[PDB]
């Protein structure tokens, strides 16, 4: 029967280049003591046959903490990708890409699970998730 909605992100607004498949290692951009996340799955996606689930900037993502402190370690938490090195296309038509690939660990409430961001945050991420926005050192 029908699973009731909400959670999974929402309808992006663009068509976006997939940069991070499953089993990628991706930087932790918060100061929980975690300093490497592992994308295991994508929270919202429907895929198909043979094709690896891939995630991109602003998406709701499923991640486990690969390394850092043992309290964060080996727990599964939702994450939002804050940066990806693969270009994102804005409506105006400029292509924006980031230096590194990073996500933060996020609470199921969509509030940060981390004390503060480091580095810039995509405008897209802020719109969808306004509590990542209010944790932001920088919004570009």
Partner 1 sequence: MVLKTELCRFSGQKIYPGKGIRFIRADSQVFLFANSKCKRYFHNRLKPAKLTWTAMYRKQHKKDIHAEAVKKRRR
Partner 2 sequence: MSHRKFEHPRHGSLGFLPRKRCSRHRGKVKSFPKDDQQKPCHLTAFLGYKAGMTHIVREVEKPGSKLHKKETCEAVTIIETPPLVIVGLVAYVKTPRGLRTLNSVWAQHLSEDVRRRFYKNWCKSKKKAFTKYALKYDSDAGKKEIQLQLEKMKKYATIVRVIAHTQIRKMKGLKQKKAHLMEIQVNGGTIADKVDYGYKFFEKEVPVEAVFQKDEMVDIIGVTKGKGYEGVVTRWGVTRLPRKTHRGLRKVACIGAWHPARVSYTVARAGQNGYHHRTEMNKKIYKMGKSGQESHEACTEFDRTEKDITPMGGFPHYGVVKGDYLMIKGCCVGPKKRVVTLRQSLLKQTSRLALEEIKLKFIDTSSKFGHGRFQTTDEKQKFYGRLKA
**Which residue numbers belong to the known binding site for Mg(2+)?**
50
What residues from 114 to 133 belong to the interface with partner 2 (CB under 8 A)? 124, 127-128
Give the C-alpha separation, 7 to 25, whole Å.
23
Task: Find out whether 60 and 14 touch, Cβ atoms under 8 Å.
Answer: no
Pick one of RNA, partner 2, partner 1, none as the site partner of residue 120 (Cβ within 5 to 8 A by kind): partner 1
Contact status, residue 59 vs residue 44, Cβ threshold 8 Å: yes
Q: How far is the CB of 90 from partner 1 (least distance, A)?
A: 9
CA 49 to chain centre: 24
Q: Which does 23 bind (CB under 5 to 8 A by kind): RNA, partner 1, partner 2, none?
A: RNA
Residues 11-70 that bind partner 2 (CB under 8 A): 11, 13, 48-50
For position 3 contacting partner 2 by CB under 8 A, the verdict is no
* Cβ pair 111, 132 in contact under 8 A: no
Q: Residue ranges for the binding site?
A: 50
- Contact residues for partner 1, defined by CB under 8 A: 83, 87, 92-100, 119-120, 137-138, 140
Q: From partner 1, RNA, partner 2, none, which one binds at residue 133 (CB under 5 to 8 Å depending on kind)?
A: none
Residue with tokens 């230096």: 99
Q: Which residues from 65-94 bind partner 2, rule CB under 8 A?
A: 90-93
Structure tokens of 139? 């919004």
Cα-Cα-Cα-Cα torsion 129, 132, 136, 139, nearest 10 degrees, comes to -20
């Amino acid at each position: 029967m029908s699973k009731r909605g909400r959670g999974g992100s929402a309808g992006n607004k663009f068509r976006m280049s997939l940069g991070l498949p499953v089993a990628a290692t991706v930087n932790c951009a918060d100061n929980t003591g975690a300093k490497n996340l592992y994308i295991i799955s994508v929270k919202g996606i429907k895929g198909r046959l043979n094709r690896l689930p891939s995630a991109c900037v602003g998406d709701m993502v499923m991640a486990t903490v690969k390394k850092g402190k043992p309290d964060l370690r080996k727990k599964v938490m939702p994450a939002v990708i804050v940066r990806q090195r693969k270009p994102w296309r804005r409506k105006d038509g400029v292509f924006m890409y980031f230096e590194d690939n990073a996500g933060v660990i996020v609470n199921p409430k969509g509030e940060m699970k981390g004390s503060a961001i480091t580095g810039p945050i995509g405008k897209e991420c802020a719109d969808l998730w306004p509590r990542i926005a209010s944790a932001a050192n920088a919004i570009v």
